[PDB]
Design a protein around this ligand. Structure first.
Ligand SMILES: Cc1cc2nc3c(=O)[nH]c(=O)nc-3n(C[C@H](O)[C@H](O)[C@H](O)COP(=O)(O)OP(=O)(O)OC[C@H]3O[C@@H](n4cnc5c(N)ncnc54)[C@H](O)[C@@H]3O)c2cc1C
Ligand SMILES: Cc1cc2nc3c(=O)[nH]c(=O)nc-3n(C[C@H](O)[C@H](O)[C@H](O)COP(=O)(O)OP(=O)(O)OC[C@H]3O[C@@H](n4cnc5c(N)ncnc54)[C@H](O)[C@@H]3O)c2cc1C
Ligand SMILES: Cc1cc2nc3c(=O)[nH]c(=O)nc-3n(C[C@H](O)[C@H](O)[C@H](O)COP(=O)(O)OP(=O)(O)OC[C@H]3O[C@@H](n4cnc5c(N)ncnc54)[C@H](O)[C@@H]3O)c2cc1C
Ligand SMILES: Cc1cc2nc3c(=O)[nH]c(=O)nc-3n(C[C@H](O)[C@H](O)[C@H](O)COP(=O)(O)OP(=O)(O)OC[C@H]3O[C@@H](n4cnc5c(N)ncnc54)[C@H](O)[C@@H]3O)c2cc1C
Lengths: 162, 162
């Protein structure tokens, strides 16, 4: 037998993570959300994975379009993160209005003034209890030189110098 | 076509990660190493994944034993991390001598004075180009109240307050 759900979450509050915004576009429509469960798989050919909650049915739009982009956040941007987690109201079109964006290879929206960004095509989809897991290969890039990074730890937000 | 290997690594130097030590034991022997590519998959039942380099053949000992543990590091511990990345010499028995350890459910070594720890049984193994990916379910736990965490960013080490 496995350990209890509540006790697992209390221990994970001592494990730190860098804050992302992930996006999509195509015949099923345009969507974004705030996220921490992602990691690097290989550098030859370059490959990345992400994990999405099954209890929100609008997350099936990512699987139907077959493309996604991942954007890494800098020091001054706590207001953008609160909006894309659903804490303060608003329609999707009203959430995107808060900043400036550009296009690279696939159609998915890329953020101006990000620390880094990766534009991807889907190669595999798997089912794991409470979440779906998606694998993608990298077809476009950008990066800029800013002075601090945004981090989540012990149930609150922080800033850290490069 | 995909982007170039060297350009991918320069952009990933702007993406932060918390520092772990991962361990194993059984009929194929006892081993450890320093690591950043891991993440949380589900909370019902609790489940975690890890990624291991194919170019070092001693990493096949983890697959043969069928068990592993993951340990999260605190502020004062940069010397332990340098030893388990292979930067300063020593045999495996000589690396474990530098600190104190205990036993929970499987046999794999758990660290005294860690910020958090998770003891796991293997349920799935997959092949992805340069690395192997392993999935595990959680059968034991511990945690302690320390004041800072260890982080890797922009090709050097840092400290961050809880
Ligand atoms: C630090 C952190 C890390 C996270 N990591 C992950 C992760 O790894 N994986 C994951 O899956 N989730 C993660 N989440 C959670 C995720 O951000 C939310 O579940 C998600 O944003 C909720 O989607 P929603 O707002 O559209 O859903 P809902 O709140 O149910 O709303 C659905 C839709 O209704 C519309 N709507 C809502 N309010 C209004 C309004 N007042 N007026 C008009 N229209 C409205 C909007 O279009 C909205 O999208 C994380 C959250 C945080 C804070
Ligand atoms: C010695 C070393 C090894 C590392 N290995 C990994 C790793 O396996 N996975 C990971 O997510 N982070 C890894 N990192 C952390 C981080 O992602 C890197 O700092 C950065 O991406 C690569 O630049 P570098 O010059 O520090 O690595 P280098 O010194 O140029 O490379 C060391 C070795 O690790 C591999 N490697 C380095 N970065 C990655 C990566 N992002 N994804 C897959 N393989 C990589 C390379 O193929 C090489 O064999 C490693 C860091 C160091 C110092
Ligand atoms: C920040 C960071 C993140 C990383 N993330 C990852 C990751 O996600 N995934 C991953 O796979 N790797 C990662 N790495 C790299 C990983 O730590 C090393 O590849 C690994 O520790 C090397 O194994 P090794 O020392 O046993 O290999 P080797 O240097 O080739 O040595 C093999 C063995 O020989 C013996 N030996 C060596 N020297 C002596 C001596 N002088 N006297 C007697 N015996 C000796 C030891 O038993 C040693 O284990 C990361 C590294 C860093 C710095
Ligand atoms: C609203 C919110 C959602 C988050 N969702 C995720 C997530 O999906 N994946 C992730 O790795 N980190 C997630 N985190 C970040 C972090 O891992 C948590 O802060 C901590 O583990 C759980 O405690 P909590 O009280 O903040 O979450 P809660 O407010 O109690 O939970 C919010 C929701 O997210 C789910 N969830 C929370 N933590 C995890 C977890 N570690 N693994 C899987 N599901 C989780 C829960 O089932 C719940 O539906 C989330 C954080 C917030 C604030």
């Amino acid at each position: 037998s496995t350990v209890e759900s509540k006790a697992y979450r209390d221990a994970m509050s001592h494990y730190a993570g860098a804050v992302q915004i992930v996006t999509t576009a195509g015949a099923a429509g345009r969507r974004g959300l705030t996220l921490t469960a992602a990691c690097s798989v290989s550098d030859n050919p370059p490959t990345i994975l992400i994990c999405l909650q099954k209890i929100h049915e609008e997350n099936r739009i990512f699987i139907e379009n077959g493309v996604f982009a991942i954007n890494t956040l800098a020091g001054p941007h706590q207001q953008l993160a609160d909006a894309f987690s659903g804490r303060i109201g608003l329609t999707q079109d009203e959430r995107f209005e808060l900043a400036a964006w550009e296009i690279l290879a696939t159609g998915a929206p890329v953020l101006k003034g990000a620390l880094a960004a990766f534009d991807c095509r889907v190669v595999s989809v798997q089912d794991h209890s409470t979440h779906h897991v998606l694998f993608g290969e990298v077809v476009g890039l950008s990066s800029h030189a800013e002075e601090e990074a945004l981090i989540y730890l012990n149930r609150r937000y922080h800033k850290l110098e490069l």
